[PDB]
């Protein structure tokens, strides 16, 4: 029959809220679900929105004929600033399916071989930081892998040189960026510097389209020239300002989160690191890799796709009720209702990875076709998936086979994982030492 939701305990009028008095409200969640199961209710003041953990469930939320994306709360902050853009837009909003079209051919093979020297020229300023660390020093591991995603995304976008090398702390934009994400996460939990922040994220923005205008195969390009093949329209001027934004911060935080995660996971894995540093030394023959090179990468990418599985860094995305309909046959749930994949709770599913889920282990995805559907979703679900998938997937095994190619890593003090939450994920805190291995670059 019909069902009652399991629910965590209620205070009052707090609701469920007071459950949630914490900096990291993710990993908060994952416990409640541990607890509770494949399902759960959970209210706050004004608000309601139900977990879901099971790829039983999250099969059927991800049918994009009976539920759609939704904004959450930490969407509608963000919509302040990045707007309707494809991330924060509404699938029905003209603008969504318009950007889609108007920048989807922009990311795979193709585009993403004119994307790769790019890619190439920021990873090897990556590796020659390190090479040049003097012996008493080591390496602030998100810190780098942010200069590195930041500064790939701004050459291959928009060819604009944000230099994050060339400074010590993080570069202006960054630091706008983690305090309204900050913000935004810290604003949900209330029962009640975001202008500074903002104003400051633009700016920037307004910088990258006076370049261009003080040509390029690239997302600016695009941008400006193209015309969604349905309606004849171009991105508007609010619109594109919009897209700039979007992807400088859509495309930066959760690659560098992601290899952040790979790096930690192989420092504690020896015998893990050990495979992935043999086959970076076997296929990456020459000065720099070539596009063909990376793509022959198969346990790197292996590698990667445990650290996603574990921790993916875009750890939740919320859907709602196209209509009237019932879940699981269990739970009927009323047109507008909300729910949440809770993403590294799906990826902990027993019926589906067996009864080793925290074991860092990328022989899992050795033969991809045997994981079910809707069971590894570190991109999100349907049309509106991640667009820079392949972009971030591209550039994280390009990083990482040269960082096993030139270096071996110490974890000299001991690290113990602290995962921040800005929305996004990474390990605070995460250092090691590189050692050269006195590889010659190109
Ligand atoms: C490992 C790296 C990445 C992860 C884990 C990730 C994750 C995600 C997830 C889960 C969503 C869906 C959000 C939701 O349903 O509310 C999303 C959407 C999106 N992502 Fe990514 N992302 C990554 C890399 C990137 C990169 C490099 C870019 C840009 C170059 C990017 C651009 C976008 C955009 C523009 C959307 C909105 C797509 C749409 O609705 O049309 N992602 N991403």
């Known amino acids: 029959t019909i069902k009652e939701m399991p629910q965590p305990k209620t205070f009052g009028e707090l609701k469920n809220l007071p459950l949630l008095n914490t900096d990291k409200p993710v990993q908060a969640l994952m416990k409640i679900a541990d607890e509770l199961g494949e399902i759960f209710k959970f209210e706050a003041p004004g608000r309601v929105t139900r977990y879901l953990s099971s790829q039983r469930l999250i099969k059927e939320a991800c049918d994009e004929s009976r539920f759609d994306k939704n904004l959450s709360q930490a969407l509608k902050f963000v919509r302040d600033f990045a707007?309707?853009?494809?991330?924060?837009?509404?699938?029905?909003?003209?603008?969504?399916?318009?950007?889609?079209?108007?920048?989807?051919?922009?990311?795979?093979?193709?585009?993403?071989?004119?994307?790769?020297?790019?890619?190439?020229?920021?990873?090897?300023?990556?590796?020659?930081?390190?090479?040049?660390?003097?012996?008493?020093?080591?390496?602030?591991?998100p810190e780098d892998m942010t200069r590195l995603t930041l500064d790939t995304i701004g050459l291959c976008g928009f060819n604009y040189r944000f230099n994050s090398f060339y400074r010590d702390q993080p570069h202006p934009f960054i630091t706008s960026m983690v305090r309204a994400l900050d913000e935004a996460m810290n604003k949900l939990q209330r029962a009640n510097q975001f202008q500074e922040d903002i104003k400051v994220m633009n700016d920037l923005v307004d910088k990258i389209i006076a370049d261009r205008k003080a040509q390029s195969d690239d997302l600016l390009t695009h941008m400006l020239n193209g015309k969604d093949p349905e309606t004849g329209e171009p991105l508007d001027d609010e619109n594109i300002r919009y897209q700039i934004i979007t992807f400088l911060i859509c495309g930066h935080e959760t690659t560098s989160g992601l290899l952040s995660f790979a790096l930690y996971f192989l420092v504690k894995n020896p015998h893990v690191l050990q495979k992935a540093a043999e086959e970076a030394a076997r296929v990456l023959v020459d000065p720099v890799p070539?596009?063909?090179?990376?793509?022959?990468?198969?346990?790197?990418?292996?590698?990667?796709?445990?650290?996603?599985?574990?921790?993916?860094t875009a750890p939740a995305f919320s859907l709602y009720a196209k209509e009237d309909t019932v879940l699981g046959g269990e739970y009927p749930l009323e047109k507008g209702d909300e729910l949440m994949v809770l993403i590294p709770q799906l990826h902990r599913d027993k019926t589906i990875w067996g009864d080793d889920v925290e074991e860092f282990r990328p022989e899992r995805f050795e033969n991809p076709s045997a994981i079910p559907q809707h069971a590894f979703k570190p991109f999100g679900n349907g049309q509106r998936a991640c667009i820079g998938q392949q972009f971030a997937l591209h550039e994280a095994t390009l990083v990482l086979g040269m960082m096993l190619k030139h270096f071996d890593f110490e974890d000299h003090t001991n690290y113990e994982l602290d995962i921040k939450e800005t929305l996004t994920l990474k390990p605070e805190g995460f250092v090691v030492k590189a050692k050269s291995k006195k590889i010659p670059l190109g």
């Not at 991330?87 to 399916?97: G, L, P, Y």
């Not at 993403?112 to 090479?131: F, N, P, R, S, T």
């Not at 070539?290 to 993916?312: D, F, H, I, T």
């Open 83 to 141: 707007g309707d853009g494809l991330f924060t837009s509404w699938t029905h909003e003209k603008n969504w399916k318009k950007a889609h079209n108007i920048l989807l051919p922009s990311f795979s093979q193709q585009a993403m071989k004119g994307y790769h020297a790019m890619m190439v020229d920021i990873a090897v300023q990556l590796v020659q930081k390190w090479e040049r660390l003097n012996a008493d020093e080591h390496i602030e591991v």
């Open 290 to 312: 070539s596009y063909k090179q990376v793509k022959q990468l198969k346990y790197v990418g292996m590698v990667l796709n445990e650290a996603l599985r574990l921790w993916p």
